[PDB]
Amino acid sequence: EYKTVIPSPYVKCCGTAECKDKSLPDYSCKVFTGVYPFMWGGAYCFCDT
Amino acid sequence: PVMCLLANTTFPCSQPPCTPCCYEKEPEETLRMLEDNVMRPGYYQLLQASLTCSPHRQRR
Amino acid sequence: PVMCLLANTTFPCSQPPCTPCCYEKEPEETLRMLEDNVMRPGYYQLLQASLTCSPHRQRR
Amino acid sequence: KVINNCKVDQCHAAVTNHKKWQYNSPLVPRNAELGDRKGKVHIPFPLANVTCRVPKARNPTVTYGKNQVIMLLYPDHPTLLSYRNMGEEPNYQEEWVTHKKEIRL
Amino acid sequence: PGQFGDIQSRTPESEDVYANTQLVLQRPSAGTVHVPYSQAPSGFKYWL
Amino acid sequence: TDDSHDWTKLRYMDNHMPADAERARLFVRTSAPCTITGTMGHFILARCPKGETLTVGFTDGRKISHSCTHPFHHDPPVIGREKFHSRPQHGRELPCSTYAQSTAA
Amino acid sequence: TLTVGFTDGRKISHSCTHPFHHDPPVIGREKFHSRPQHGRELPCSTYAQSTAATAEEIEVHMPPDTPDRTLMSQQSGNVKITVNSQTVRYKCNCGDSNEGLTTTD
Amino acid sequence: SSSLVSESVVSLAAGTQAVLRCQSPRMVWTQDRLHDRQRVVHWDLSGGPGSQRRRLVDMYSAGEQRVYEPRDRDRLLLSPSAFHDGNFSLLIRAVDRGDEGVYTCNLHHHYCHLDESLAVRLEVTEDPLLSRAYWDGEKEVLVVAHGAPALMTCINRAHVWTDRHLEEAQQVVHWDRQLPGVSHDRADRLLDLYASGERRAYGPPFLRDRVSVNTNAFARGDFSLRIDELERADEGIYSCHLHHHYCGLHERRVFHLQVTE
Amino acid sequence: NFNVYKAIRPYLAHCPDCGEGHSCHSPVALERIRNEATDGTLKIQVSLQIGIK
Amino acid sequence: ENTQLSEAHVEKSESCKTEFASAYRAHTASASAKLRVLYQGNNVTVSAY
Ligand SMILES: *[C@@H]1O[C@H](CO)[C@@H](O)[C@H](O)[C@H]1NC(C)=O
Numbered sequence: 001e002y003k004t005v006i007p008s009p010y011v012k013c014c015g016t017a018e019c020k021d022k023s024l025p026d027y028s029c030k031v032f033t034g035v036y037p038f039m040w041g042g043a044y045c046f047c048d049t
Numbered sequence: 050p051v052m053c054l055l056a057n058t059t060f061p062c063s064q065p066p067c068t069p070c071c072y073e074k075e076p077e078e079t080l081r082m083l084e085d086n087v088m089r090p091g092y093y094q095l096l097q098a099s100l101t102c103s104p105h106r107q108r109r
Numbered sequence: 110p111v112m113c114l115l116a117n118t119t120f121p122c123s124q125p126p127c128t129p130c131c132y133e134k135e136p137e138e139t140l141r142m143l144e145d146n147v148m149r150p151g152y153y154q155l156l157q158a159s160l161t162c163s164p165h166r167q168r169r
Numbered sequence: 170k171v172i173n174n175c176k177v178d179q180c181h182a183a184v185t186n187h188k189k190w191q192y193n194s195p196l197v198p199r200n201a202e203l204g205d206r207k208g209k210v211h212i213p214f215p216l217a218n219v220t221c222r223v224p225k226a227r228n229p230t231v232t233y234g235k236n237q238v239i240m241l242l243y244p245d246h247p248t249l250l251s252y253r254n255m256g257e258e259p260n261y262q263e264e265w266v267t268h269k270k271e272i273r274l
Numbered sequence: 275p276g277q278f279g280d281i282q283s284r285t286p287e288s289e290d291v292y293a294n295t296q297l298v299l300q301r302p303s304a305g306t307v308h309v310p311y312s313q314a315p316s317g318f319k320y321w322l
Numbered sequence: 323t324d325d326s327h328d329w330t331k332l333r334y335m336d337n338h339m340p341a342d343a344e345r346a347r348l349f350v351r352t353s354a355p356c357t358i359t360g361t362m363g364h365f366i367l368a369r370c371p372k373g374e375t376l377t378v379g380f381t382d383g384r385k386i387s388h389s390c391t392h393p394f395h396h397d398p399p400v401i402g403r404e405k406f407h408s409r410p411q412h413g414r415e416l417p418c419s420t421y422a423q424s425t426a427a
Numbered sequence: 428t429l430t431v432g433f434t435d436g437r438k439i440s441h442s443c444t445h446p447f448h449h450d451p452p453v454i455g456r457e458k459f460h461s462r463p464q465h466g467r468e469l470p471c472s473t474y475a476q477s478t479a480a481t482a483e484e485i486e487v488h489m490p491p492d493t494p495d496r497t498l499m500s501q502q503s504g505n506v507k508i509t510v511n512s513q514t515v516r517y518k519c520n521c522g523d524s525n526e527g528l529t530t531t532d
Numbered sequence: 533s534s535s536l537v538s539e540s541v542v543s544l545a546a547g548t549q550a551v552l553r554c555q556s557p558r559m560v561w562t563q564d565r566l567h568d569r570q571r572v573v574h575w576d577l578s579g580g581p582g583s584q585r586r587r588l589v590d591m592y593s594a595g596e597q598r599v600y601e602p603r604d605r606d607r608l609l610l611s612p613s614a615f616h617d618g619n620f621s622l623l624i625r626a627v628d629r630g631d632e633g634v635y636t637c638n639l640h641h642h643y644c645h646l647d648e649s650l651a652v653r654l655e656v657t658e659d660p661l662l663s664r665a666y667w668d669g670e671k672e673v674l675v676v677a678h679g680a681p682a683l684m685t686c687i688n689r690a691h692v693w694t695d696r697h698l699e700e701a702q703q704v705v706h707w708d709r710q711l712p713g714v715s716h717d718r719a720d721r722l723l724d725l726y727a728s729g730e731r732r733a734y735g736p737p738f739l740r741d742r743v744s745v746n747t748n749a750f751a752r753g754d755f756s757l758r759i760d761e762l763e764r765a766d767e768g769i770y771s772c773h774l775h776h777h778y779c780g781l782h783e784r785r786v787f788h789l790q791v792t793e
Numbered sequence: 794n795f796n797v798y799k800a801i802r803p804y805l806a807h808c809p810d811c812g813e814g815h816s817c818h819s820p821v822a823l824e825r826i827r828n829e830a831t832d833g834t835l836k837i838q839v840s841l842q843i844g845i846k
Numbered sequence: 847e848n849t850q851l852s853e854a855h856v857e858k859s860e861s862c863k864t865e866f867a868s869a870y871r872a873h874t875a876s877a878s879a880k881l882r883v884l885y886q887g888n889n890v891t892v893s894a895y
Pocket residue numbers: 610611619621622623683
């Protein structure tokens with residue numbers, strides 16, 4: 001058996017993160033734009049769009 | 050305006066003859082009100098004025 | 110035993126600069142120690158010295 | 170009430186209800202001597218339209234065949250696949266798959 | 275890829291695994307914070 | 323019964339006696355249990371998995387558990403193309419219908 | 428499915444499901460339910476009850492945030508960011524502070 | 533119609549992109565109902581200008597009250613059915629000299645992002661004939677003899693705080709278009725964007741390809757009208773309408789689009 | 794005496810789905826499922842911790 | 847001597863406000879369309895019948 005290893009996602013609040021090329025087996029990365037985070041007290045970011 | 054009818058009196062469908070909470074003073078006149086103004090949704094406002102209203106003993 | 114290095118002091122791995130009760134005194138030195146020295150099993154004996162430390166509250 | 174000389178089979182008490190009322194269903198009958206008599210208050214809980222989070226399907230794997238297609242599907246539950254031709258007629262076919270199959274079209 | 279035998283290491287103590295699992299990372303929909311992807315064909319379940 | 327809406331109680335009639343019980347005594351199964359969601363008056367809106375009968379159960383003031391039972395083939399309407407597990411974190415959006423959570427219709 | 432339910436501090440039980448189809452991979456040439464008494468040898472494998480498992484990575488890291496704007500009292504155009512024994516990063520997009528990290532309101 | 537908030541004039545060039553800003557943190561909602569009926573009541577205690585307020589007791593919507601200090605168990609009591617009538621009053625079984633100070637009853641609704649609070653000053657005396665309840669001009673002050681109970685009233689009977697409907701799922705933003713010469717009320721609807729995700733575009737194909745709102749609008753709180761490739765025929769009165777009927781929010785922004793430099 | 798989660802640098806919690814259709818906020822969110830034990834029992838990984846204060 | 851009258855019939859439901867299906871007559875259609883011309887480096891897209 002394998003392990004689909006999903007590391008912790010990297011929310012760049014009010015900024016566009018760029019791809020960190022990591023030599024991992026079946027490595028895959030993407031920075032999604034226009035996301036919205038939220039938590040207990042509403043939005044996790046003060047940032048908007 | 051919508052007017053109810055207990056076969057002798059044309060009280061409105063917002064003025065019941067036992068205003069208000071007509072059941073808890075007299076049941077059978079409310080039963081006759083049901084059998085008469087079954088055709089009226091103004092009678093459903095009259096039961097709103099007879100069930101979800103503020104009687105002489107309660108202020109809800 | 111084996112020596113863990115925090116890029117300034119090559120201390121023994123189960124003898125940090127925070128003997129005893131490593132995390133229990135402050136969390137941030139343990140934070141930095143997990144940040145840099147995660148590659149070492151001697152640091153996992155130091156993790157024991159943060160986890161199964163046997164501090165003054167424990168009898169060992 | 171006191172009724173002279175009628176045994177329990179000969180007598181019948183029936184407490185007529187006109188105050189205390191636990192409602193029921195119109196599959197159980199009415200009064201034995203009455204025709205029409207109504208009492209009308211609505212029922213709660215209507216229905217409304219909504220839009221739900223249905224799952225998205227599992228992406229299978231494909232490749233060319235010699236004017237054909239090789240496609241290996243992995244399902245998670247049995248689901249319908251289907252196919253059609255976009256010409257003068259569909260010739261569309263629909264099947265269910267339960268387990269992981271190679272299908273060639 | 276996806277066949278029983280995609281996961282490939284040399285010895286059982288060797289961790290250098292060649293494997294092709296096809297993780298196409300989907301977009302999490304709207305406001306929800308997670309990491310959906312293209313689903314991973316596990317060969318080792320249906321090895322058995 | 324006092325022209326109020328006390329959410330803690332109910333009524334149930336037993337031999338000329340309208341007796342009351344606690345709101346939270348309600349436990350329903352088909353063969354598997356269900357979800358107690360919308361409870362007012364006559365009406366229980368409930369989500370429930372697959373079965374072949376239905377039994378609603380509760381307990382009395384003397385702690386007498388009673389259950390109504392009807393043999394009824396319950397199945398959900400299949401929504402979308404899937405025959406899926408449940409709703410996941412990642413799916414898409416398809417319109418359907420649900421009994422609304424309004425108070426009085 | 429899988430369904431794991433905890434209970435709150437105010438004794439409020441909450442379920443938790445994630446979509447996973449459990450299958451039992453049945454073992455050997457016997458296709459049954461549970462371990463009987465008249466059994467035979469089967470070499471199986473399971474997780475032992477020992478706690479000292481050797482060096483298994485779970486990613487733990489820096490706390491992302493807890494955005495707590497509930498204590499930010501609006502004192503008639505004045506934001507008293509109440510802290511209450513915490514270390515609040517504040518990003519005041521206004522006068523009287525731009526950013527900072529406080530322990531006092 | 534709506535309550536207006538900002539009225540502005542925008543003059544832009546033909547063939548450019550118009551951005552009519554319409555954003556709202558209070559209309560933000562997501563395609564999930566993740567604790568969208570989550571409310572909290574909590575009582576805090578403060579002690580003058582040179583002391584820090586302290587949280588005593590809180591309670592989540594559809595839940596039971598939580599006490600923070602084990603000493604205060606069975607001593608600080610709230611009504612368990614506070615959310616039925618909006619009666620959030622707090623009973624202190626027996627008061628002492630250390631109990632003097634300002635207590636705040638705090639309501640917070642996560643869906644409408646509403647917060648409301650009331651203050652009461654507790655003053656604990658020793659003589660029962662000095663015990664009174666009075667209004668100091670801006671808050672109730674309760675004078676209670678030592679060892680007597682203090683019922684600090686917090687009553688807000690508004691429907692938004694009690695478990696009435698508040699299952700609305702009808703946040704809606706409208707983009708409207710009022711062409712020149714045509715009077716209002718017969719204004720043409722351009723776009724409907726519903727909180728549930730459902731969208732309504734109006735008009736011939738000529739218009740729908742050039743008028744759009746970003747697809748993650750409710751996720752980011754951005755309902756700005758984007759007009760690509762401005763034409764002179766595109767000028768007119770555009771209006772953004774934000775509607776939360778249950779919490780009573782009716783806002784509009786109006787943009788007079790002119791085609792110039 | 795295996796005080797195993799003192800050094801747990803945190804995630805301030807959340808649950809993606811507790812059931813009920815919509816989301817929630819709780820560390821009852823399980824992260825992964827271990828199943829390969831041939832006897833048929835299950836090892837499940839919840840995000841809360843039990844037993845040790 | 848006890849007899850019993852039994853009467854029943856069928857009517858509509860409250861389902862019919864949303865749950866229904868239109869039997870419908872369909873004949874000749876409206877040829878509506880959209881075309882994009884790249885006239886001289888100018889992508890102009892129109893939509894009409
Ligand atoms: C409000 O709550 C308090 C709690 O002690 C109770 O004494 C009081 O009667 C309540 N008010 C009403 C109007 O029910």
